[PDB]
Design a protein around this ligand. Structure first.
Ligand SMILES: NC(=O)c1ccc[n+]([C@@H]2O[C@H](COP(=O)([O-])OP(=O)(O)OC[C@H]3O[C@@H](n4cnc5c(N)ncnc54)[C@H](O)[C@@H]3O)[C@@H](O)[C@H]2O)c1
Ligand SMILES: NC(=O)c1ccc[n+]([C@@H]2O[C@H](COP(=O)([O-])OP(=O)(O)OC[C@H]3O[C@@H](n4cnc5c(N)ncnc54)[C@H](O)[C@@H]3O)[C@@H](O)[C@H]2O)c1
Ligand SMILES: NC(=O)c1ccc[n+]([C@@H]2O[C@H](COP(=O)([O-])OP(=O)(O)OC[C@H]3O[C@@H](n4cnc5c(N)ncnc54)[C@H](O)[C@@H]3O)[C@@H](O)[C@H]2O)c1
Ligand SMILES: CC(C)[C@H]1OC(=O)[C@H](C)[C@H](O)[C@H](Cc2cccnc2)NC(=O)[C@@H](NC(=O)c2ncccc2O)[C@@H](C)OC1=O
Lengths: 252, 254, 251, 267
């Protein structure tokens, strides 16, 4: 019972193979009471989140919608109880149009597309924190998903730029969260005619990781998120935890 | 004559108190032939660029207009000569609305404002490179201006996020520029000249104190010389990198 | 029961205010079976380890002593059982002569002193890992103690050089540990109390978004225990910062 | 010239092909007056330094010898002139016994060997700075040679640990040098094909070691946006000279990467 009696909001569940689905699954197994967030296909999300070990209320949240954000805190409290507060927040939201990641050349991505990607992947981490910090308990934890953007790589393109922005956003969210006695951290996960480029990237990851890396298994990264949601990392804030097999510490 | 016979495009001159003004001044002193770019007040910018040691053609460039960027290659070539190409490109444009930096709380900056800031301060480094790489010579150099965003600090707020984005953009611009035999680097400068006033005072005082060789905020010439060192042939194996012209303050805790 | 049924070797307990004592205390509370290591004042150390919630065998280990190394693991297996193996290793060993840190100028530290410091503070992480990896279970964890050496600072001097070496040693220990299915990580702690030393120690509290209490070693001990658990299984050759987030903030 | 009228101390010239030789060659071409340092094979180094474009005095310096360090400054001043001071120092000294790098397992390197390596590769950067800072002019520059140790890699082993120690030493040397108005920086070079490096590619260390280093060198050129030529030391020599010049005056305690941009690229 690592997360026993903790109220945790989990965003980004779209499929049963989503890291957010495994974070929610592992958190419930560890005794956490969950609140879930869905963006567009809510009835589809409801049917995915029915396969979770325990029942949890599903709330609508389009992170680009100002009204959804301004009402989020009220809707969460109605779902957990008038006098109850959140102990954790999981930001597992990421988006970049295909012009900004994949086959499309880096220079050919229009700003409107990259901006939408930065809005959803980086700015929204601050939006969700602004909306939920007033309904969070001291000793609380905000966890976001990152993909190590310290070095450029093919096909990830503008999504790497959005993750660099996200890391910087996290350092500032930590400053704001600190006032509430809440921690804010990121988990940098390993990977979970541009098909050849991503194959090269995935093969290289397992090769570099001293303990190896299984791309078809999201549970080691879900456990890391849960470790950050627990009271077992209480002096860690504005930081990045690498759940990538230790591949970022190895050149070859 | 560090930059002797080099054709260099310099963006971001609006006043003579700018780093872009000193980069242009130092580059001309080192024998570089310049092409200059201005945003809106071209009449006032032409008056400012007259304070530069030598004459240089002025071209209008609003980095948010895809019409100006598409034209750039054609406009720069007619200013330097039909058969001549650029040897250097200086990106010295940076903007963030006051909602994104200063006194305004970090959470109170609307996305439209932060997006405009990221567009001008980060995305435009890729826009300018896309437009100018086809008219650049091998051994060429693209330089951008940065402010170390690795750690959060007061007031800088969303400009720190835009600079983090710029660093990432630079690593990708290096990949594209490499195909032309062109280098792409950023120069991370130290600070250049009631609560907000006290915070910035603390940041500037701390910089000089941390810097092993000290830091003079009223002097932009050590950072302009660093940009010129990157525009030269003296750093030929450096790309996708950040050169710190901050007195060594980023390597020191206290 | 975060560490339930885990056999963990803990080094560096010399006092009741040491991080190593609190790691051992927290680990026992979480259901871990411990093996302890002592360097010199082993009679005094035994009287300190009696203040631990549960009984644990104390073994002699001078990290500069070649015979103590290589005899270590055989002595561990006799203490835990012939068929039992270790699940965790805590390296909480650090030393630098006063010529290498404090008031003495950086240039005035002789190599013999800095070398002794690097031997005990950095090289010994590889020595302890070499000796204990053959008696470690897959899913195992090796944890070392670090103090962020990425930037120079007053007084820390050659100890900063030894921690930079330690960080590099840990990336290589991870490569070796990986073939046993064992993780190797460092915990970079904020200042822990035991003018120039005072000024630095107060900066951390102001920079840390959640603040920093130098008189409390329990948040750093819990971080070590989180690394010893199965809750960070994809983390290796890494550094976890338990400094209140101070390293992510300029001011 | 870039270095016109500058007095520069250059250490580590042992072969007519090494980085220290090209630094010295490029510096002399740029108008620098040099002072050279030699380890043991003095008469051999003297005829290797005769290949340099201009004549330069050669001084004996065993970096592990306390007496050689204590007399250093006096010997340099006698070679340049009683009233003249040094404008630059180039530390191009690096050593690690084969127990600490190559085929030998990481855990099998004895401390005495790794310590000798750290003494020569890292500690000596501070030793040379201590000895030469009192005879250095303000605006001066100290440059050391590095190989990016931020990530572990095959064969480099304890030399990576010595290199990590060197970067930390450099940040503290910058603090000391700052008092004299002198900068201290490291140049992190990409892989350079030295006499030993060619031999390991040929298979002097075996098939496995030969394959590992080939993988490391091939990967470097592939990662480098502008490519990487291991047989050419001149781009790294020019970077050292850029740091010795007045064109990077606000850079200290830092690392300049002359590795083709490889360290900024994952793939
Ligand atoms: N898959 C990997 O290899 C990997 C590696 C590291 C990090 N990550 C990160 O993990 C997170 C989860 O992504 P994933 O890869 O598991 O895939 P995913 O498809 O499961 O998650 C992305 C989610 O973003 C949500 N989203 C998109 N636009 C939104 C909007 N406007 N409002 C609210 N939510 C919106 C979608 O509903 C979706 O659930 C992302 O931040 C991603 O960048 C993934
Ligand atoms: N001031 C400091 O303390 C400091 C420190 C480190 C780095 N820098 C950097 O130095 C660089 C030079 O700027 P500065 O310090 O002179 O400040 P600045 O306020 O003068 O920069 C604004 C510049 O951007 C241009 N610009 C704005 N919007 C534009 C648009 N849409 N299209 C095209 N051009 C546009 C303006 O014409 C102007 O030249 C900046 O990138 C800044 O971030 C400054
Ligand atoms: N104290 C702090 O503020 C702080 C901050 C960050 C990191 N750390 C690190 O944490 C570790 C332990 O810290 P602590 O608070 O317990 O202090 P400590 O004084 O108890 O740690 C030093 C230990 O080294 C041991 N030791 C010395 N020489 C030895 C040898 N030859 N063989 C074996 N052991 C030997 C001693 O027995 C002693 O317990 C150290 O490595 C230290 O650098 C401490
Ligand atoms: C056997 C094997 C480990 C081999 O490894 C390599 O060649 C690596 C992959 C790489 O190519 C770097 C590239 C380089 C060369 C020079 C400087 N910095 C980086 N080589 C070095 O680091 C080499 N160093 C020195 O010659 C040296 N000389 C002067 C000052 C410090 C010094 O460390 C040695 C230590 O290395 C080897 O022989």
């Amino acid at each position: 019972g690592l997360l026993d009696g903790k109220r945790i909001l989990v965003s980004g569940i779209i499929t049963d193979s989503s890291i957010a689905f495994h974070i929610a699954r592992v958190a419930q197994e560890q005794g956490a009471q969950l609140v879930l967030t869905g963006f567009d296909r809510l009835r589809l999300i409801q049917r995915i989140t029915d396969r979770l070990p325990a029942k949890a209320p599903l709330l609508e949240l389009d992170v680009q919608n100002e009204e959804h954000l301004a009402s989020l805190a009220g809707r969460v409290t109605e779902a957990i109880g008038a006098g109850n507060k959140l102990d954790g927040v999981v930001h597992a939201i990421g988006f970049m149009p295909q012009t900004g990641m994949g086959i499309n050349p880096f220079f050919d991505a229009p700003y409107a597309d990259v901006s939408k990607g930065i809005h959803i992947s980086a700015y929204s981490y601050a939006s969700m924190a602004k909306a939920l910090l007033p309904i969070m308990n001291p000793g609380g934890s905000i966890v976001g998903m990152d993909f190590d953007p310290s070095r450029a790589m093919p096909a990830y393109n503008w999504m790497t730029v959005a993750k660099s922005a996200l890391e910087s956003v996290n350092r500032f969210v930590a400053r704001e969260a600190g006032k509430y006695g809440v921690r804010s951290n990121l988990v940098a996960a390993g990977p979970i005619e541009a098909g050849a480029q991503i194959q090269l990237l995935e093969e290289g990851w397992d090769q570099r990781a001293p303990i190896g890396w299984n791309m078809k298994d999201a549970t080691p990264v879900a456990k890391t998120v849960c470790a950050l949601l627990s009271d077992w990392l209480p002096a860690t804030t504005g930081d990045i935890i690498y759940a990538d097999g230790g591949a970022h510490t190895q050149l070859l």
